[PDB]
Amino acid sequence: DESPSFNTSTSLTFSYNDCDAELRIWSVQEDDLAAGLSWIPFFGPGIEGLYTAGLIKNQNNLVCRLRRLANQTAKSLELLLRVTTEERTFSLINRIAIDFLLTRWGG
């Protein structure tokens, strides 16, 4: 489970054809909070209007370097799921957040 980064300017510097150039995406809301009242679950957007659409453009051939991340993540994530015993959902965000700190404080 490797992960690139977001190093810009000092273009995008990434620290770890057979692609599609266009890539439009759906995402969880970033700025739904505009009137101070939509954050209530009763006044929320529901499940139909929950998702916001946008476009990701190819600046420094980022799209190919994300589509080629599919092999070397699904190779290891199957072996990660084979160890655990639960058939429920399984979050990986805390695992990566711990692992980055374990890598950074090696010395």
């Binding site: 992960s3 690139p4 980064s5 977001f6 659409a53 799921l81």
Partner: protein
């Protein structure tokens, strides 16, 4: 790169259709098989690429019941599709649950599984892990 908060870890899932993988249902069935003895596993992912084609496939038997597993309450239909193919089939010589041959994932609404579920719209694809903060994600998307 250095992230300041746990929320910055994004997990986009990209479908196979962006790699010029053929996606007609008459030949896609060789990427699916049935096997006993493998429990299913789910992974939560934050966002994902949509699909050019989606599938709604149920497999029946001569006894009349569905050989696919029932979905849990967190399993939902896939959000964005362009051309969904509602397919009904029948297979009398299969046992166990459904698995993907390439190691790819059956993507659903923010849940990726390694098995098929009854009456749910999915796609085929993998997921990737990465970190982008708010500023770099704001100079993109917009």
């Amino acid at each position: 790169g250095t992230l300041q908060k746990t929320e910055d870890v994004h997990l986009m899932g990209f479908t196979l259709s962006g790699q010029k993988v053929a996606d007609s249902p008459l030949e896609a069935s060789k990427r699916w098989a049935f096997r006993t003895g493998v429990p299913p596993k789910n992974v939560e992912y934050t966002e994902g690429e949509e699909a050019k084609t989606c599938y709604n496939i149920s497999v029946t038997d001569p006894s009349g019941k569905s050989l696919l597993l029932d979905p849990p309450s967190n399993i939902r239909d896939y959000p964005k599709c362009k051309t969904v193919h509602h397919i009904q089939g029948q297979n009398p010589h299969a046992q166990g649950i459904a698995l993907h041959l390439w190691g790819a994932f059956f993507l659903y609404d923010r849940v990726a599984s390694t098995t098929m579920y009854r009456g749910k719209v999915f796609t085929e694809g993998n997921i990737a892990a990465m970190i982008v903060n708010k500023t770099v994600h704001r100079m993109i998307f917009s």
